[PDB]
Design a protein around this ligand. Structure first.
Ligand SMILES: CCCCCCCCCCCCCCCCCC(=O)OC[C@H](COP(=O)([O-])OCC[N+](C)(C)C)OC(=O)CCCCCCCCCCCCCCCCC
Ligand SMILES: CCCCCCCCCCCCCCCCCC(=O)OC[C@H](COP(=O)(O)OCCN)OC(=O)CCCCCCCCCCCCCCCCC
Ligand SMILES: CCCCCCCCCCCCCCCCCC(=O)OC[C@H](COP(=O)(O)OCCN)OC(=O)CCCCCCCCCCCCCCCCC
Ligand SMILES: CCCCCCCCCCCCCCCCCC(=O)OC[C@H](COP(=O)(O)OCCN)OC(=O)CCCCCCCCCCCCCCCCC
Ligand SMILES: CCCCCCCCCCCCCCCCCC(=O)OC[C@H](COP(=O)(O)OCCN)OC(=O)CCCCCCCCCCCCCCCCC
Ligand SMILES: CCCCCCCCCCCCCCCCCC(=O)OC[C@H](COP(=O)(O)OCCN)OC(=O)CCCCCCCCCCCCCCCCC
Ligand SMILES: Nc1nc2c(ncn2[C@H]2C[C@H](O)[C@@H](COP(=O)(O)OP(=O)(O)OP(=O)(O)O)O2)c(=O)[nH]1
Lengths: 446, 341, 167, 368, 54, 96, 48
């Protein structure tokens, strides 16, 4: 595992040498290939190195980050085009990636938290540094302060577990089952925030709408998963307490998913709409996760991988349109099929994946969470039908409205799509399908 | 120690005064050291070029005189009834001693004088007040073992220290309210141990030692001046301000390690409720630190243009850059430190 | 006059409980009231100064009494001393807060702030843990606390022997 | 005060001058080296001012030669637009955005109404301020007096005159006063000030004698503008400084002889004012104890960076002086990548400096 | 597209002597930026004696 | 009680000293006047306690030395007050 | 096993302060018997 870490560390100096922007991604893509060869993992931890291991769960999430963090560099070519502190920008991602790799590769719960939040600050610099609109302040704080407010109490819950278990290592924790009501709320309300839950999602539409394209990728790509990944490790020893209060979370997320889907239909901003679509699906992920069944756990792991690639993908396309039309509102963006017809194909495939269209990896995960939820209670069929219905209602509205109609009138002349953009879109979607072939690996982490 | 040979003396006599207090095996001996310390600070603090400075020399004097006076009052009373420097079972007479010491250090309920005297101090004066003057008072409180009185000061310290600081724009006055909060953490760390407190104090002084220099080297006294401040490399200015985050105790930086060890011990001692109020209130403290970072994290500003150049002192800056480097990368050296185990 | 709130079961000794809670109502009222009349309001004359003492303390007594009565009334009416009782109690004091502040919303929302506050207190009583417990570990030194001594004066001879006494 | 004829020979320093250009003088240096031991009758400061183009420079050089005084040439924007290696920054202006384009006296005389005028006037005040402090370091460390052409005290006249003609706005004048107030109080006022009262008509004739290209072609040097300066020197500056410094007024010593002027100065006595402690005349330079001498020496020798950091007064409601963020990024790129601006002076290898691997030293009271 | 940067109007927030001015605080003014308040020279009233004639 | 028959009077006197040190009088000197009033009472108690010891009254000199220095220092600060504000009135100081 | 024991051991030390490791405050009586020495020394000198 140290092979990855020391590779990244020695790539830090590449931020300082000039005319090395493009030589960075290749080193970032090549390491993904090298990491892609060392899959021999199992449910239990493997490749121990001083505190760094990796199981099938951590592997897929790590590999997802390397892929996504590599696409960030492709997407944010404008930073290179205007030399807008590109060297500092590169160092932000290389640091950020290292924090993620450690976070998932950490074997002890305290470490996971140590790099859990620490990744936030590199993200926070990203929003303020390279965001256009003035609201990146008022969205910079929300991201920082919702997270800190609920992560600091989690730190107490972590330490209280040493004095009982005597250690942080995940395997040793699973041997215990705790009965204290507050402790349950000090290790899940901290992750329920970052999922996010419907009622505490108020930061998500602000952070995503204002953050740059690259920040949108990682915020939607890996930050929403750290909440999901964290839960998968800490419901193991909260099984008893999970049964007394699960019905509160399931109802909120399920009803939260439906209500947000209606909110999606009344949006008029591409960035906002995609961001609210994240809350909709993340409600199903959390819902199935708390069902605790074998299906709900394997499925939740799957959907987190698939959704991140998609929602990250859809943020590419919004940036492409915004870069030229200059406005992210739906009213400006119309009939793009008649300006950039080649682009509209990628709009569809990424859009179709978001609505659980086949043969994507997204449908495999969504079939499963749906199974666990139904088994949990037949009453869940009511909204789970509504949520899947409306989860396509806004996706069509997102795609159709922005691509189909007659062209805008005031738009000034702008460049057409470039090869970089097409290559970026392929790398987002094409794995999202081929992964179905080897779901063997990225599914059975239990 | 900036102007004349005389300033050199007053600094040393301050060290001797503090040492006499914390090395004294009786209340009366301890009280003497406070008097030595009192007159060592005032001449350092009084300068007649400023109408404000002499006012600062006053508020401190009246407060400290009253504190030592009431401190001696109770100490005489304490050993009038027990006939020992120590009280077998803590009672009201020991509470009175605690009240004076808190006022001597400007804890929450009696902090009012402390920010209100920070208007008219040079930065180097504030550092002596913020860090060193809090040694002798807080170190004697370790002897007294009242919980509720000490506990109340912590709860009010973090609250008043934070909420008050949101409204300020003067950095000297802002740091005062920031220092009141860190004071709250000490007293919390003081009811559990001292070795944590000794560790936590050293880190607190370290960070304040850094932030004071950056303002002192570039003579900044107001928030607006930060935006108007000129630096060659906006990357450099961006990195210097990343010390505030450490002062906010964010884990990627060195400044969290102190906060971290204070939680691993408070939690070990079952003081869960306290940590909730403290750590939660630290966010508000973390807030106005970010308001300073508005001048760095955004990194293209509208700035006045009659300056192209930075004029800075070498030795202070030379020592400041070294201290800043650890303030950002000091975490991986926790392996070396062996004072927590 | 010195009654403790939890000296008896929840649905008991009403006069004992009201005294216990009003005790903390008055103390907090005066404590804040002292700051109010000197630092913030600064009334003039010996009579209006009492109004600030009454204004800040009076309704704060009404809150504590309301919580005890509603909590006590709920404990008997429902037939069980459970968390909803204290939740039911909190909304009463919140209602008094609005009447104090003449504000419909302030009373309602503050009841929830007070409502969840009471719930957690009942949680503590029923599960067997404390909010400000006496510290079990109190450290008075480092590892070498008995070794690190720097004094110069020669310590004259001893007068006690760890050895068993001779006779 | 004592010319070469009076001493009959060159100045004889009381003790060896302290190498203030190369060694710092902090508190711990002050213990072993004292300041008062080097002060003579000639340890004074002289400001040789006058109207525009009154031959001050020629008069100062001759004057400073007789009194064995150090002569400090008047500041000019070449000190900002020419780096140490000699490269001309102005050549970079085609790249820079219009607001950041270089601005000089030539430009002022040719487009006086341009918004960069407010900038240009503050720079002159800042330049004089730094130069003035440099003179004090020379005085306090060497004991030899200094001769200045125009002190920062007299600089507000040009800003005020420009304001009356309407070149500046209300905001720019408001900004200038705050800088001057924020900074001027920290200097030591000159012992002696000499003025060369050329009548307004004479200076207008005199300017055409230089036959400088831009000046003759310009419109700024009007009767109104040149008249405003005369009213400002005599009514505001000279009336104020005379409360502290001895004041001599001549029609034109530049057209006159200096040997008569030196003999006029030596007649002036500088001790009669010493008797009363609180006497305003030459109050600034009255140090009772040796500590006070060293404190002043430390301030200017060792704390000048502080003195030059007071010019940071944030004022953005004024639109002229504000530099847009987009320009700043572009300007930073061009300005600091020019030959010799990559690093501090004396380290730019591409400009020929050598031995950087084994080089660790930096200059004192040097930039950066 | 147009990129927002911290402008003069944004920073007017920090211009005063306090973030949230009210009637009492808005009346004030920012202290001198160099933080030195030069004392103001005031009157000089000297006692007088009719020394003599008695 | 013992404390009431022997140590009550000095303590009651001490608190009256403090209430002088805080009351609103125009001149700063009113603080200095009440300052050594309190010191006079501190001496009185300290002298009660030192005499419970047979021979330890020598420490009275130690206390008096610090009494004058705080008064002497308190008087110096007043002098520095005058030569920046021109007067010592409390209401003349910036309220902060 | 070692950090659940070591933690347990520390509690016993703190409960009774019966070891000179962390939870023990050295109370030195050295100075008083220095004073007693000095008193004895001065007892001999008395006289003229
Ligand atoms: C009549 C005055 C005659 C001229 C000044 C004294 C000449 C005789 C030299 C005696 C030694 C120095 C005495 C002195 O100036 O005070 C210490 C002066 C400063 O005086 P100070 O006023 O700053 O107070 C000094 C305070 N102590 C003593 C604590 C340092 O210089 C020094 O302190 C260090 C240098 C000593 C050698 C200077 C010669
Ligand atoms: C392990 C402990 C040691 C950790 C490493 C310590 C050293 C880290 C800093 C090393 C880089 C220092 C030089 C530098 O900042 O990079 C150059 C440039 C900065 O910007 P600029 O002002 O243009 O630099 C000109 C000098 N080449 O580069 C940039 O634009 C960004 C540089 C990174 C800034 C990080 C803060
Ligand atoms: C909304 C605003 C209100 C938020 C909630 C505030 C109430 C927090 C709970 C009250 C304070 C701490 C309570 C506590 O001490 O929990 C201890 C409990 C019992 O465990 P035990 O160690 O065995 O007790 C000692 C031996 N009998 O065991 C434990 O609980 C220990 C596990 C850690 C508990 C941390 C609880 C604090 C959580 C704060 C959340 C802040 C809000 C974040 C949003
Ligand atoms: C972190 C912040 C966590 C704050 C709350 C933590 C405590 C969770 C609630 C625990 C609980 O027991 O709630 C259910 C409880 C019902 O229990 P009970 O009082 O017996 O009434 C019905 C059965 N007879 O009823 C209650 O306790 C009321 C819960 C109200 C919560 C409002 C928020
Ligand atoms: C939210 C604001 C709550 C303020 C604190 C409420 C409070 O004072 O509760 C504790 C108090 C005493 O309760 P007790 O545990 O018996 O300790 C007495 C020791 N002399 O009062 C009590 O008896 C507890 C009664 C429940 C109060 C719930 C308030 C919500
Ligand atoms: C709308 C605002 C209206 C105005 C404010 C109304 C409130 C005014 C309250 C004034 C009185 C405050 C002082 C109360 C003193 C009570 C005793 C005390 O000092 O605190 C200790 C108390 C119980 O002590 P404990 O450590 O738990 O040991 C058991 C004792 N029998 O500790 C406790 O009992 C704590 C009770 C509160 C715990 C809340 C935890 C949940 C917070 C959720 C937010
Ligand atoms: N706007 C402005 N122009 C100034 C200022 N000071 C000097 N100048 C300009 C005015 C003229 O265009 C020009 C006159 O130069 P000088 O009077 O200094 O003559 P110089 O020193 O070159 O030699 P001389 O005076 O003849 O001995 O410089 C100033 O403070 N503000």
């Amino acid at each position: 595992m140290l092979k990855i870490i020391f590779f990244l560390l020695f790539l830090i100096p590449f931020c300082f040498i000039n005319n090395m922007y493009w030589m960075v991604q290749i080193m970032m893509f090549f390491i993904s290939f090298i990491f892609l060869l060392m899959n021999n993992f199992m449910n239990y931890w493997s490749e121990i190195s001083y505190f760094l291991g990796c199981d099938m769960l951590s592997y897929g999430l790590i590999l997802l980050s390397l892929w996504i963090c590599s696409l960030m560099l492709l997407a944010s070519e404008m930073i290179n085009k205007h030399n807008n502190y590109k060297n500092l920008f590169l160092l932000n991602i290389i640091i950020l990636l290292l924090l993620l790799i450690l976070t998932f590769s950490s074997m002890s719960l305290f470490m996971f938290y140590l790099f859990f939040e620490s990744s936030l600050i590199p993200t926070l610099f990203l929003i303020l540094g390279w965001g256009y609109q003035p609201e990146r302040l008022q969205a910079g704080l929300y991201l920082l302060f919702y997270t800190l407010l609920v992560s600091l109490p989690m730190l107490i819950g972590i330490f209280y577990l040493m004095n009982k278990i005597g250690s942080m290592n995940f395997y040793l924790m699973n041997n215990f089952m705790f009965n204290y009501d507050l402790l349950y709320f000090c290790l899940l309300c901290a992750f329920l925030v970052k999922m996010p839950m419907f009622l505490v999602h108020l930061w998500l539409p602000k952070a995503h709408v204002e953050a740059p394209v690259s920040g949108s990728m990682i915020l939607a790509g890996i930050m929403l998963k750290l909440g999901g990944y964290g839960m998968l490790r800490v419901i193991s020893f909260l099984q008893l307490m999970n049964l007394k209060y699960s019905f509160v979370w399931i109802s909120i997320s399920l009803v939260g998913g439906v209500l947000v889907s209606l909110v999606c239909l009344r949006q008029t901003d591409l960035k906002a709409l995609i961001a609210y679509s994240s809350v909709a699906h993340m409600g199903i992920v959390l819902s199935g996760l708390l069902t605790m069944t074998y299906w709900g756990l394997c499925g939740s792991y799957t959907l987190m991988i698939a959704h991140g690639l998609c929602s990250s993908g859809l943020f590419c396309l919004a940036n492409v349109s915004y870069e030229r039309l200059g406005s992210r509102s739906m009213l400006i963006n119309k009939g793009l099929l008649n300006f950039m017809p080649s682009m509209t194909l990628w709009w569809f495939l990424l859009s179709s994946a978001n609505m659980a269209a086949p043969p994507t990896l997204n449908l495999l995960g969504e079939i499963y969470l749906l199974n666990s939820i139904v088994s949990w209670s037949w009453i869940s069929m009511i909204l789970l039908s509504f949520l899947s219905f409306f989860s396509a209602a806004y996706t069509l509205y997102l795609y159709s409205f922005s691509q189909h109609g007659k062209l805008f009138s005031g738009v000034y002349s702008f460049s057409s799509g470039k090869i970089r953009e097409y290559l970026l879109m392929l790398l987002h979607w094409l794995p999202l399908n081929l992964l179905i072939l080897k779901s063997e690996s990225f599914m059975l982490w239990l | 120690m900036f102007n004349n040979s005389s300033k050199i003396l007053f600094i040393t006599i301050m060290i001797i005064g503090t040492l006499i207090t914390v090395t004294s095996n009786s209340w009366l001996g301890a009280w003497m050291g406070l008097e030595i310390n009192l007159l060592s600070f005032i001449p350092l603090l009084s300068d007649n070029n400023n109408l404000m400075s002499t006012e600062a020399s006053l508020k401190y004097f009246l407060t400290q005189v009253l504190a030592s006076t009431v401190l001696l009052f109770s100490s005489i009373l304490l050993m009038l009834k027990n006939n020992m420097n120590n009280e077998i079972n803590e009672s009201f007479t020991s509470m009175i001693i605690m009240s004076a010491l808190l006022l001597k250090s400007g804890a929450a309920p009696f902090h009012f004088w402390f920010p209100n005297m920070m208007e008219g101090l040079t930065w180097m004066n504030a550092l002596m007040l913020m860090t060193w003057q809090k040694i002798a008072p807080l170190m004697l409180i370790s002897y007294l073992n009242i919980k509720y009185l000490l506990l109340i000061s912590v709860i009010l310290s973090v609250i008043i220290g934070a909420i008050g600081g949101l409204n300020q724009t003067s950095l000297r006055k802002l740091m005062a309210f920031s220092s009141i909060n860190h004071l709250g953490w000490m007293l919390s760390s003081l009811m559990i141990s001292e070795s944590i407190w000794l560790i936590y104090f050293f880190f607190y002084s370290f960070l304040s030692f850094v932030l004071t220099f950056m303002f002192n080297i570039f003579k900044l006294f107001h928030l607006n001046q930060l935006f108007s401040w000129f630096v060659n490399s906006k990357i450099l200015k961006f990195t210097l301000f990343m010390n505030f985050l450490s002062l906010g105790g964010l884990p990627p930086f060195l400044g969290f390690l102190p906060k971290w060890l204070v939680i691993q011990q408070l939690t070990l001692c079952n003081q869960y409720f306290m940590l909730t109020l403290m750590m939660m209130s630290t966010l508000i403290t973390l807030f106005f630190y970010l308001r300073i970072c508005y001048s760095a994290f955004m990194m293209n500003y509208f700035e006045n243009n009659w300056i192209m150049k930075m004029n800075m002192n070498s030795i202070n800056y030379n020592m400041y850059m070294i201290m800043t480097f650890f303030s950002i990368f000091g975490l991986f050296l926790i392996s070396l430190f062996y004072f927590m185990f | 006059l010195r009654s403790k709130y939890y000296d008896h079961p929840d649905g008991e000794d009403a006069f004992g409980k009201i005294v216990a809670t009003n005790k903390y109502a008055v103390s907090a009222g005066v404590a804040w009231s002292m700051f109010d009349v000197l630092t913030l309001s600064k009334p003039q004359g010996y009579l209006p100064t009492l109004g600030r003492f009454a204004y800040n303390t009076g309704p704060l007594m009404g809150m504590a009494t309301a919580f005890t009565l509603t909590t006590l009334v709920a404990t008997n009416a429902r037939g069980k001393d459970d968390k909803i009782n204290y939740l039911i109690g909190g909304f009463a004091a919140g209602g008094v807060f609005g009447a104090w502040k003449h504000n419909h919303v302030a009373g309602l929302c503050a009841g929830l702030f007070l409502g969840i506050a009471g719930v957690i207190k009942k949680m503590s009583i029923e599960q067997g843990w404390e909010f400000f417990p006496n510290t079990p570990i109190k450290q008075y030194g480092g590892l070498n606390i008995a070794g690190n001594d720097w004094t110069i004066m020669a310590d004259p001879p001893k007068n006690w022997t760890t050895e068993k006494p001779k006779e | 005060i004592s010319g070469k004829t009076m001493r009959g020979g060159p100045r004889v320093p009381k003790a060896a001058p302290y190498p203030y250009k190369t060694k710092k003088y902090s508190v711990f240096n002050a213990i072993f080296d004292k300041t008062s031991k080097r002060f003579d009758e000639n340890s004074k400061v002289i400001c040789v001012e006058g109207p525009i183009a009154a031959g001050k420079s020629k008069f100062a050089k001759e004057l400073a030669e007789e009194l064995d005084m150090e002569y400090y040439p008047a500041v000019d924007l070449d000190l900002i637009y020419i780096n140490s290696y000699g490269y001309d920054m102005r050549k970079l202006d085609p790249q820079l955005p219009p607001s950041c384009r270089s601005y000089d006296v030539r430009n002022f005389c040719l487009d006086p109404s341009h918004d960069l005028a407010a900038q240009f006037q503050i720079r002159m005040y800042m330049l004089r301020y730094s130069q003035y402090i440099d003179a004090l370091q020379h005085v306090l460390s060497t004991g030899q007096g200094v001769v200045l052409e125009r002190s920062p005290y007299s600089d507000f006249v040009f800003m005020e005159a420009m304001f009356r003609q309407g070149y500046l706005s209300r905001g720019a004048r408001s900004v200038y006063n705050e800088l001057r107030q924020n900074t001027i109080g920290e200097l030591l006022k000159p012992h002696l000030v000499i003025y060369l009262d050329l009548p307004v008509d004479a200076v207008k004739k005199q300017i055409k004698a230089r036959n400088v290209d831009y000046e003759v072609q310009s419109k700024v040097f009007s009767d109104a503008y040149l008249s405003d300066l005369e009213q400002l020197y005599k009514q505001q500056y000279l009336k104020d400084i005379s409360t502290h410094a001895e004041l001599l007024i001549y029609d034109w010593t530049a057209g006159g002889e200096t040997e008569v002027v030196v003999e006029d100065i030596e007649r002036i006595d500088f001790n009669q004012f010493e008797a009363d402690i609180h006497n305003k005349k030459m109050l600034d330079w009255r140090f009772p104890l040796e500590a006070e001498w060293c404190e002043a020496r430390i301030k200017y020798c060792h704390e000048k960076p502080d003195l030059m950091n007071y010019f940071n007064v944030p004022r953005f409601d004024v639109p002229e002086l504000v530099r847009s963020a987009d320009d700043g990024k572009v300007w930073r790129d061009v300005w600091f990548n020019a030959p010799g601006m990559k690093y501090r002076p004396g380290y730019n290898a591409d400009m020929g400096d050598e031995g950087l691997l084994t080089k660790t030293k930096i200059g004192i009271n040097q930039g950066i | 597209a147009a990129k927002w940067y911290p402008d003069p109007e944004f920073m007017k927030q920090f211009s005063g002597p306090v973030m949230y001015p009210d009637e009492v605080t808005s009346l004030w003014t920012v202290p001198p930026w160099n933080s030195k308040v030069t004392p103001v020279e005031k009157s000089v009233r000297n006692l007088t004696l009719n020394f003599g004639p008695q | 009680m013992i404390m009431i028959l022997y140590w009550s009077l000095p303590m009651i006197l001490f608190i009256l000293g403090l209430f002088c040190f805080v009351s609103n009088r125009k001149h700063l000197l009113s603080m200095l006047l009440s300052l050594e009033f309190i010191v006079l009472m501190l001496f009185f108690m300290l002298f009660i306690y030192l005499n419970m010891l047979n021979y330890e009254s020598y420490f009275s000199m130690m206390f008096l030395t610090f009494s004058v220095c705080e008064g002497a220092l308190g008087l110096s600060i007043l002098v520095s007050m005058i030569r920046t504000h021109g007067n010592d009135y409390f209401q003349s100081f910036s309220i902060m | 096993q070692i950090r659940l024991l070591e933690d347990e051991v520390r509690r016993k030390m703190s409960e009774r302060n019966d070891y000179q490791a962390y939870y023990y405050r050295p109370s030195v009586a050295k100075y008083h018997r220095i004073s007693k020495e000095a008193a004895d020394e001065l007892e001999a000198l008395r006289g003229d």
